[PDB]
Amino acid sequence: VNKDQIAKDVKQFYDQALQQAVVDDDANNAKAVVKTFHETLDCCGSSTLTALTTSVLKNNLCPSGSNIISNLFKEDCHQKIDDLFSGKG
Amino acid sequence: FVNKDQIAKDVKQFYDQALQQAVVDDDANNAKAVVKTFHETLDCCGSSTLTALTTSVLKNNLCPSGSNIISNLFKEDCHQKIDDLFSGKG
């Protein structure tokens, strides 16, 4: 049961929710899901740029307490997903 | 395209594999690392209440920092935490 493939698939699932969530579309619960990921992994986007734009534009999605500049130092959620499945946290 | 159920099952399966390897083989340092990371991240210590208990007993260092053995009987197991993640319940 391959590690890299599942990791890719989680990243994809996240990305899906994120695309649905930034729109305030929630027909598949994407908002709660993105919020759950972001709080669990302490990230706010599929990349630095994305985290930062999501924080600027959809600030309610980011980890509570975190400010916007922090998305330039933190790891993005794809990185954190990789850490989860590779064992670095 | 990714279905929620399937990826959650796949993640659970992956977690189970790592947990088994991590508990019975003390040199599978990659499995241990992963297991430990799942555990700290999701705040749980097994596939189920019982396996969380046996994990806390055989390799307690795999459990979340400052967690206690008896609490594994009252806490959500990692399967339920993984479902919570993909389902949207923090």
From Swiss-Prot, chain A:
Outcome reported for the amino acid change (mutating K8E): No effect on integrin binding
Effect of D83 to K/Q/R: Strongly reduced affinity for HCV protein E2
Single GO BP term: cellular response to low-density lipoprotein particle stimulus
Subcellular location per the Swiss-Prot or TrEMBL entry: Cell membrane; Basolateral cell membrane
Entry PTM: Not glycosylated.
Main location: membrane
Record GO terms (molecular function): cholesterol binding; integrin binding; MHC class II protein binding; MHC class II protein complex binding; transferrin receptor binding; virus receptor activity
Consequence recorded when altering F13A: No effect on integrin binding
Disulfide bonds: C43-C77, C44-C62
Keywords per UniProt: Adaptive immunity, Cell membrane, Disulfide bond, Host cell receptor for virus entry, Host-virus interaction, Immunity, Lipid-binding, Membrane, Receptor, Transmembrane, Transmembrane helix
Residue ranges of coiled coil: none
Impact upon substituting E75K: Mildly reduced affinity for HCV protein E2
Effect of K74E: No effect on integrin binding
Tissue: Expressed on B cells (at protein level). Expressed in hepatocytes (at protein level). Expressed in monocytes/macrophages (at protein level). Expressed on both naive and memory CD4-positive T cells (at protein level).
Cellular component aspect of the GO annotation: basal plasma membrane; basolateral plasma membrane; cytosol; extracellular exosome; focal adhesion; immunological synapse; membrane; plasma membrane
Residues on Extracellular side: 1-88
Transmembrane among keywords: yes
Domain notes: Binds cholesterol in a cavity lined by the transmembrane spans.
Disorder: Immunodeficiency, common variable, 6: A primary immunodeficiency characterized by antibody deficiency, hypogammaglobulinemia, recurrent bacterial infections and an inability to mount an antibody response to antigen. The defect results from a failure of B-cell differentiation and impaired secretion of immunoglobulins; the numbers of circulating B-cells is usually in the normal range, but can be low.
UniProt name for this protein: CD81 antigen
Gene name of the encoded protein: CD81
Swiss-Prot record, chain B:
UniProt similarity note: Belongs to the tetraspanin (TM4SF) family.
Protein name: CD81 antigen
Result, substituting D84E: Strongly reduced affinity for HCV protein E2
Effect on the protein upon substituting F14A: No effect on integrin binding
Subcellular location: Cell membrane; Basolateral cell membrane
Disease implication from the record: Immunodeficiency, common variable, 6: A primary immunodeficiency characterized by antibody deficiency, hypogammaglobulinemia, recurrent bacterial infections and an inability to mount an antibody response to antigen. The defect results from a failure of B-cell differentiation and impaired secretion of immunoglobulins; the numbers of circulating B-cells is usually in the normal range, but can be low.
Consequence of substituting K32E: Reduces binding to integrin
Extracellular membrane side: 1-89
Cysteine disulfide links: C44-C78, C45-C63
Residue(s) at site: Important for interaction with integrin: K4, K32, K36
Domain note: Binds cholesterol in a cavity lined by the transmembrane spans.
Post-translational modification: Not glycosylated.
Included range, full protein: 113 to 201 of 236
Quaternary structure annotation from Swiss-Prot or TrEMBL: Homodimer. Part of a complex composed of CD19, CR2/CD21, CD81 and IFITM1/CD225 in the membrane of mature B cells. Interacts (via the second extracellular domain) with CD19; this interaction is initiated early during biosynthesis in the ER and enables trafficking of only properly folded CD19. Part of a complex that includes MHC class II/HLA-DR molecules and IFITM1. Interacts with IFITM1. Interacts with IFITM2 and IFITM3. Part of integrin-tetraspanin complex composed of CD9, CD81, beta-1 and beta-2 integrins in the membrane of monocyte/macrophages. (Microbial infection) Plays a critical role in HCV attachment and/or cell entry by interacting with HCV E1/E2 glycoproteins heterodimer.
